[PDB]
Design an enzyme around this catalytic site. Structure first.
Site, PDB file in Angstrom:
ATOM      1  N   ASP A 184      -2.232   9.911  21.259  1.00  0.00           N
ATOM      2  CA  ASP A 184      -3.257  10.644  20.540  1.00  0.00           C
ATOM      3  C   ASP A 184      -4.569  10.526  21.290  1.00  0.00           C
ATOM      4  O   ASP A 184      -5.238   9.498  21.169  1.00  0.00           O
ATOM      5  CB  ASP A 184      -3.382  10.086  19.111  1.00  0.00           C
ATOM      6  N   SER A 220     -15.738  24.756  26.467  1.00  0.00           N
ATOM      7  CA  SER A 220     -15.061  25.916  27.002  1.00  0.00           C
ATOM      8  C   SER A 220     -16.071  27.040  27.230  1.00  0.00           C
ATOM      9  O   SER A 220     -17.038  27.171  26.495  1.00  0.00           O
ATOM     10  CB  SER A 220     -13.956  26.371  26.056  1.00  0.00           C
TER      11      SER A 220
HETATM   12  N1  LIG Z   1      -6.127  13.188  16.480  1.00  0.00           N
HETATM   13  C1  LIG Z   1      -6.970  12.253  15.669  1.00  0.00           C
HETATM   14  C2  LIG Z   1      -7.495  12.862  14.375  1.00  0.00           C
HETATM   15  O1  LIG Z   1      -7.936  11.821  13.506  1.00  0.00           O
HETATM   16  C3  LIG Z   1      -8.632  13.823  14.652  1.00  0.00           C
HETATM   17  C4  LIG Z   1      -9.713  13.443  15.438  1.00  0.00           C
HETATM   18  C5  LIG Z   1     -10.808  14.275  15.598  1.00  0.00           C
HETATM   19  C6  LIG Z   1     -10.819  15.494  14.958  1.00  0.00           C
HETATM   20 CL1  LIG Z   1     -12.221  16.521  15.096  1.00  0.00          CL
HETATM   21  C7  LIG Z   1      -9.756  15.906  14.188  1.00  0.00           C
HETATM   22  C8  LIG Z   1      -8.665  15.068  14.045  1.00  0.00           C
END
Ligand SMILES: NC[C@@H](O)c1ccc(Cl)cc1
EC number: 3.4.23.22
Length: 330
Positions: A35, A199
């Site tokens: 992740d 982007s």
């Molecule tokens: N992939 C981690 C999740 O907690 C996550 C992190 C940041 C954002 Cl803006 C959305 C979801």
């Protein structure tokens, strides 16, 4: 040093990807969700509430000769999708695709929320954002990548996610056979702890490219592509019958539709997401309404280049002193 591991979709929609990770001595292999939008390495374990475990492989630190309790350390995390988990912390040896880190913080779940329990294929998460987001208290811990960095041939990892197919996470090197053309690199802000970049714009199908700055994060832990409402509206306007459904929670489209591609800019370069990548199938079994892979980021506070976007590219996460992101077509 380097490492190389295969990452595999958990289901037929590419909702997430799992990568085998060896923890402990002797090795305990768990399939973790890598992740790049979080910074905790946490696992289902022998300490997880029994009612909250259903099919997952668990880490048992008492069976690892290299496991050590990190005394007094706890963790607790809530993700963007509303899920959460918490527990205590061990240090242990962790290997990914031949690359070994000793003394890695392995966060052992005592509690996980229902969505984790309900997903039998994910044994935990391995966070690859910046260590500033790590939730361990009272002493914040480093990510696997941060710990490995100094030992790597080059301070990078790459994500090469497949469409309905396996892909690869590499650490410490760039596989020049894995992409076409050249890699375009772009500046990263670490101020919020994410791989945050800008982007340079977008196009819908064969439409003209619109130059416009879109601030967002590269997040392998998010399934879909979340973009500003203007952009998303422009995309789905090209799909006959598409609509935003408040009851379903976003854009849906007739399963009989052919979706256009979506192009996003990286500097002067362009990454094309084929229309098939944007189809996430029936909203419910047997439905003729399909869920869209491009959704509005309104009310998130940031745009998210999740798997839908990232799997169209070979992506370099460059953790040099000044971090950058690289994108290539493949
Ligand atoms: N992939 C981690 C999740 O907690 C996550 C992190 C940041 C954002 Cl803006 C959305 C979801």
């Amino acid at each position: 040093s380097t490492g190389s591991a295969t990452t595999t979709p958990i289901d037929s929609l590419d909702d997430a990807y799992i990568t085998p990770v060896q923890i402990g001595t002797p090795a305990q292999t768990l399939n973790l969700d890598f992740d790049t939008g979080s910074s905790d390495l946490w696992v289902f374990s022998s300490e997880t509430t029994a009612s909250e475990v259903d099919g997952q492989t668990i880490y048992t630190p008492s069976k690892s000769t290299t496991a050590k309790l990190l005394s007094g350390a706890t963790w607790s995390i809530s993700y963007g999708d509303g899920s959460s988990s918490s527990g205590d912390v061990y240090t242990d040896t962790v290997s990914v695709g031949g690359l070994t880190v000793t003394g890695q913080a392995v966060e052992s779940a005592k509690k996980v929320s229902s969505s984790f329990t309900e997903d039998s294929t994910i044994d935990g998460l391995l966070g690859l954002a910046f260590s500033t987001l790590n939730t361990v208290s009272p002493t914040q811990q480093k990510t696997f990548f941060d710990n490995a960095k100094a030992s790597l041939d080059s301070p990078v990892f790459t994500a090469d996610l497949g469409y309905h197919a396996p892909g690869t996470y590499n650490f410490g090197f760039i596989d020049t056979t894995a992409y076409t053309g050249s890699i375009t690199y772009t500046a990263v802000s670490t101020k919020q702890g994410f791989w945050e970049w800008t982007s340079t714009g977008y196009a819908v199908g064969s439409g003209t490219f619109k130059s416009t700055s879109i601030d967002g994060i590269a997040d392998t832990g998010t399934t879909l592509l979340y973009l500003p409402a203007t952009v998303v509206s422009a995309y789905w306007a090209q799909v006959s019958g598409a609509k935003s459904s408040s009851s379903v929670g976003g854009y849906v489209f007739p399963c009989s539709a052919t979706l256009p591609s979506f192009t996003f800019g990286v500097g002067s370069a362009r990454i094309v997401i084929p229309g098939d990548y944007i189809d996430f199938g029936p909203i419910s079994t047997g439905s003729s309404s399909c869920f869209g892979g491009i959704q509005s980021s309104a009310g998130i506070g940031i745009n998210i280049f999740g798997d839908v976007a990232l799997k169209a590219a070979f992506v370099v996460f460059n953790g040099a002193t000044t971090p950058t992101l690289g994108f290539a077509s493949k």
